[PDB]
Adenine DNA glycosylase (Escherichia coli), 225 residues
Amino acid sequence: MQASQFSAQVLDWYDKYGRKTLPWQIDKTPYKVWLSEVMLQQTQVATVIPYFERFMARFPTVTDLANAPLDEVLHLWTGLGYYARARNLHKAAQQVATLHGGKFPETFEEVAALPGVGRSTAGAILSLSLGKHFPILNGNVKRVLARCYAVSGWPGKKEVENKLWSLSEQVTPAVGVERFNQAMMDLGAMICTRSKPKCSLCPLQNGCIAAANNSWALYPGKKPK
Ligand SMILES: Nc1ncnc2[nH]cnc12
Ligand SMILES: Nc1ncnc2[nH]cnc12
Ligand code: SF4
């Protein structure tokens, strides 16, 4: 299947089966999408929700987060693990307060310059909260694209990561980008799982090479040896 059919099938699936009601998806702003993306990169949705709610209630705005003591941020992070994310969250909130006058940057370069925010998280912040035309590529999306397009090779090799970023760019639409990017994350998280993917519940099952060859185990490639 062509890039235009990938996008259309994923958006039609999201419409009927996607997750649309999580708290970071309601009255989306750059700040809320950033906060949730950072919490979500190493923690599952069920554990993140109470923390997302407590952080939004305590820190309504990024300036509130910036002005809080770091020890108060770490105390409220307790239970989420991977505390470098919390230290960078706080540094990034202070960078928005100092460089961007308390308003979360809405351009790619300034968002990706924030501590703890990579190319995929910056693309996620801007595409999901403002509908800007940016692709994402976290572990879950890497798996969906690598299986659908048979991208063998370890994504830790620059050549394979570039291939996967090119594929993401090719299948990501401008129209409906916020719905498409959330749907790709949902598919990788819930359908195209690391083991035994639920191919029969996947909107890409008619064109996916791994589903046609029952070779999901080969994609993406793991680290050598
Ligand atoms: N917005 C999101 N929804 C679900 N899983 C995610 N993983 C990272 N970001 C996510
Ligand atoms: N199906 C699965 N879902 C999530 N993590 C996994 N690790 C191995 N198999 C998995
Ligand atoms: S058809 Fe199966 S292997 Fe292919 S993208 Fe969907 S869940 Fe993953």
Notes: Residues 21-132 form a domain with the Endonuclease III; domain 1 fold (CATH 1.10.340.30).
